[PDB]
Amino acid sequence: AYQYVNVVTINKVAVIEFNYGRKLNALSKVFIDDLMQALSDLNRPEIRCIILRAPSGSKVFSAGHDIHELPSGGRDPLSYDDPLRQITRMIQKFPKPIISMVEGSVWGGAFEMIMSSDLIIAASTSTFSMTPVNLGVPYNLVGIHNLTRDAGFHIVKELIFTASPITAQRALAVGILNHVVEVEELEDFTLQMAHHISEKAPLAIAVIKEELRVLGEAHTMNSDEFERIQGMRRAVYDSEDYQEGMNAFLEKRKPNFVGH
Amino acid sequence: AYQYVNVVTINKVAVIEFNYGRKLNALSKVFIDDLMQALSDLNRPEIRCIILRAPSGSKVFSAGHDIHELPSGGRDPLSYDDPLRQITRMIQKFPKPIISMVEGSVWGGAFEMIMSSDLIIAASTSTFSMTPVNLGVPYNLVGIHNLTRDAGFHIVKELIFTASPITAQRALAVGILNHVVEVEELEDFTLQMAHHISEKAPLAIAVIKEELRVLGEAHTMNSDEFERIQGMRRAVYDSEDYQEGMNAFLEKRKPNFVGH
Amino acid sequence: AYQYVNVVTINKVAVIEFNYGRKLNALSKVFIDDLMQALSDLNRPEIRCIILRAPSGSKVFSAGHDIHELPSGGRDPLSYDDPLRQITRMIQKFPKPIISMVEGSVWGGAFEMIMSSDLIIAASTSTFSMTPVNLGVPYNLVGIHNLTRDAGFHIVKELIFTASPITAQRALAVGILNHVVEVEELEDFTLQMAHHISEKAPLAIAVIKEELRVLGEAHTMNSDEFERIQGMRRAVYDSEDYQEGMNAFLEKRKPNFVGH
């Protein structure tokens, strides 16, 4: 029923498997629109737990935001109705637990997407990179906030400022992952936990997830502080460095950033 | 001088030992009223540090909220004056450190109670479960907030959505516990730390504890968000699933949750 | 040049080395004024990353606030324009990453200072203590907040209430440090990471750092709560214990705290 995902439901658990490997499951508008439609279709009383996964043996879980669809004009790359911003809101408001079951490497916006989900179970060979400083992208407040609820600030700043991949073992040690398992155990481990969750009280799960959502969002600031930050972000997405980040990716070369 | 607790004072350290083993130290009104009286009586200048403990050899530290005192149908089970809500506020506002020294298994409200205390030192054989989703309970905002200050969101969501016990070793790894020790060393280790804290400046301890309390609570939201969450909670504590959770527990059978 | 720091630039990396070993790099006004001048001088487009370090072989990284410079009594010791409060604001608002490269022991205000920096890389032999309860000091809200973004509340309360040192290995485990390395490798490891960060997009790093700073501060409270805390702090800095803490340190004896 979907071009870019495959859904299998057994009992009360649904697995949403990405079907966009020819583009390394990059978060293009057409891929995200399918993922959201699939989730909306599973918002039914008889579904109690969702798993998100890439196909078995994927080297790349998701290559993150489709760099071709990043606006290189004068507009904000991560506005409120950007597909990545829509799917993280939808995951976080969804009244059922969503488990990210990760095999392969996770990049940029896709790292934010799994951090927005409720649990992350990962193969021992998976790797995680947060990439905006590679491309000159001024990541937005909501998007950065979504990266701060698991690991501490010093770890988050290392991940962002270096853009270096971290292993699953390190991602477990710093609090980003729930569980790391050998890849041959990943599906069996994840289905055991999803089917267990699906026997618990769904209305209690939904209200507790929504309470955590609101508490997690409840770092408040005044209008002047947000407008000041928006001005700073606009100076970045208007920058020569932002154009250079995109151009360098599309030309398959290393960017030369100059601080303008 | 209390029916349900025993208090020992060693210089500047007070040990409050539960005496409600016939009910597995369940957080009944009569038990919590004695605990709160004991704490109030120890709010004196020559006391500097409190330890909360179950008796030596306890299999169960606390079975959590007394399910017989949970209101069935229509009343908020976790309103502001509920005993569990009163004791977590009292622990958090108490101007001396309160150390939970844990032997045995810890369940639901009792897990929130040790999470509200300042330090947790646990036996290597202790276990920890958060149980609302077993019973259909819409846990309240303040109570959920009290579970978010140590382990990250993904870990808290695993504990709540699974209601599965975690070991002391895992609870240490994820940041819930301060120390794990062999049960034979638990009392000596905890008293050594309490005596050490009691040599320090108590007015500085009290103000720093209060600063951490107000900073930990400073996740603010507007009245409409709180009323929306209260409406969601009422729908859960009015639900068939909430009645089925209570009944299933009291009848020792597996609940059948249907999502209304 | 500077009397109390030495600055070296290697390509786009600047290393600020303390030069106040005769006072164990205590945070005196004259030392902090030099550190702040050196940091302000390095806010240039050809500088991409800052390392703060003590001299190679230092037993003591920093002994913390200069206890001679604490007000005698009846005056807030951690007011907004105190040197420690100035340097942490400056580190946090600085538009380049600041890495604390730690060899030796870290005490009190100096622990808050490295916690305010972006990344901490430490020698396997370094140690960390938070000391206000040794001296009777009512640490301020901003200062305490700066200690809560890495490790959990129970961990922070143990560090503050015991004032006991922790090892680099424990500091790694609880989320305070990024990396622990053998002292012989510390400089090479830190420089390699700083050089790596120096090729990334500086405007993206600066706006993301500022987004994290704003989100990290966005725990808000009403005026009454702040004034209530300030009144509690004033009762501490007016106390006999505060005078006894100061006196004991200078006279080189154990304080006798009495709770007034």
Next chain:
Amino acid sequence: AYQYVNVVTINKVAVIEFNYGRKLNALSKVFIDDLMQALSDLNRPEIRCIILRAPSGSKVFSAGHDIHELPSGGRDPLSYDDPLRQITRMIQKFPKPIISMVEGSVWGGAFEMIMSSDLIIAASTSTFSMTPVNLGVPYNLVGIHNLTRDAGFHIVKELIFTASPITAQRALAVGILNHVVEVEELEDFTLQMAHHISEKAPLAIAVIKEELRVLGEAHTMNSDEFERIQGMRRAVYDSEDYQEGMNAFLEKRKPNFVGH
């Protein structure tokens, strides 16, 4: 068409006239559901401005909440999905100006309803009463906040604590009303203002209205403060005085309030 309202369109202006005079336009569930449907149906680009009115000559604009439909005992009378709570949210979120055009007396929930609208224009003979203290009702935070954006706190407390009606002339002087007009000029005056607003930029009006709505709601508090207020409200809606207020109103006698 609608059973309980009549809608007329004059170019870009829609007038919604109450048709529930046999029950003095009391805010029963069936009347509010019709009013909300009529508003929803007018959320189309060719409508620019809404007027809410009672029929010409009405002695009673609205008698407020239907006292028969108030939750009888132990149930929150102003929960999130109560009709009065739903209509005020809808009015405030509606992307066109809504003008309350008032002829006759306004009572209780109907006063909060016109206060939630964007402008109020009233007949010189109209009167206004806020009545919960007559019935023993614990008015909810959102509802009280809606009464606080026009007149000062001393004026709102006088209105609520006395439940005394005020004249249109006094309501204008204290800032509740935009305009007071002779009854035979009311309809003409209101329509010329609605037509004038309808010539202005609708997307600008919508975003400015929504900005005012969020700034008006942005009085934020922590969870414990909300739960404490909810507990106090529950003690009121559980009180004998709350029963006495309802019963006295329905039996047409003076209530005897005793303070429990």
Next chain:
Amino acid sequence: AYQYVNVVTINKVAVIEFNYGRKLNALSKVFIDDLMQALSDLNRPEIRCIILRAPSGSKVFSAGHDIHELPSGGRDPLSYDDPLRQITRMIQKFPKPIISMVEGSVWGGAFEMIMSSDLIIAASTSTFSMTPVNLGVPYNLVGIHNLTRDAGFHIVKELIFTASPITAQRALAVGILNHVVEVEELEDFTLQMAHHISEKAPLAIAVIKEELRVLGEAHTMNSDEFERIQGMRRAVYDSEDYQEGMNAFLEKRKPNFVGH
């Protein structure tokens, strides 16, 4: 029963009359202690409304804070435990309405005290001044907040920056006062209103008063902004101008302020 106040009970209304004419009802610690004891004594179910008043015929309602009890310099003059701060908190938290009935001139902290009360009814000859800029006093955030809930910002700034007295008629027009009456009618007009309030539901009044209090306080800021303000206040109470303002009053001369 009190040295410095006289209490009369009329049915369910209590009238607390100042008896400190010798010092023009300046808010000395001992006067405020009796006023607070009198309030505490009246916190009984048989009392439904309080009036605060000066004696009949008073030229001065209250000369405001006792200038002789302000500190000489280098100390916060309006700390949390100051008598003016205590009495405004107690009036705002008191579960019965408190009406200020004003005959005579109102100065400084006494103007804040009546503003903290629920309703103000004043004689046509009464006058109102806010005086901190006459004395060089840095008024505190809570205190300034208490002046902003009735008149608009421009009016409040005029009152504070000019320290010029305003008439009762002007105070009515700008929203400070509920009612202005001829002095011969003041006592019976105020009592008629207090008797009317005393017939209403007291639990409903108490919860609505508490809801208004927390909504009024719910302007939230981060710790850094509060500490920044406190630093600015400290510069003022450390200033030569603060000492000049205190000296000029003592010496009965016009202060010469210089901005240091």
Next chain:
Amino acid sequence: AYQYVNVVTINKVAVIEFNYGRKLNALSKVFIDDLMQALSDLNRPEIRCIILRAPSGSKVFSAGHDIHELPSGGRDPLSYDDPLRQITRMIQKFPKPIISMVEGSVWGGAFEMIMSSDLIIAASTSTFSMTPVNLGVPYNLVGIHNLTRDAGFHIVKELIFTASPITAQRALAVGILNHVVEVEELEDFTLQMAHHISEKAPLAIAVIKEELRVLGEAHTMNSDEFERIQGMRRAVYDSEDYQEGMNAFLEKRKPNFVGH
């Protein structure tokens, strides 16, 4: 001196007279840069109060934002470093009182500018309008908040949704203006007040002004709410209606708005 302003100092009062009459004191960058420099140059201890005025006899006080300089492409017209946004921040942070002394008509951004100042004294013939809905402009959160601290919400909505001029008498009645005087008395009245203020304690005035500024700004919201509002504002400044409003103004014709 300054091309676009004239400054006269009388004792401790500085009168800043607009000198941009050929564009009716529209807020061009060149005019605002001169006003800000003149204000900065007056930040000296010997200056105690500022008056902002148009030239004596002016029909137009200020024609508002320069519509030729409004980003007429598709970028934010009211971004953080726009001249109107800069001058309102500078007026509000300025440590001396700033009185707007108004003769003539005040439009749009110029209305926000006088609302941001401390006191407004106006000629009886002056008039005031807020005009964004004439041009299709999505006024920003900070700008809208600057209009909400004097009159109530209903009055602000009437001013904005109608864009109709109000008289000085109406502006006084609704709490926008401090005083209205005959045009012949305007200088005498305003200078008498400015000289009176100039006798008072400047450090007390500066800290109380900053306390009001912070309290006035302290309506806080979460990142998601800000980003949602920014998305809505962008849809408006990208609209055909925004282009129509600008074109219509340039072509001296009535705009025809269509809701796209």
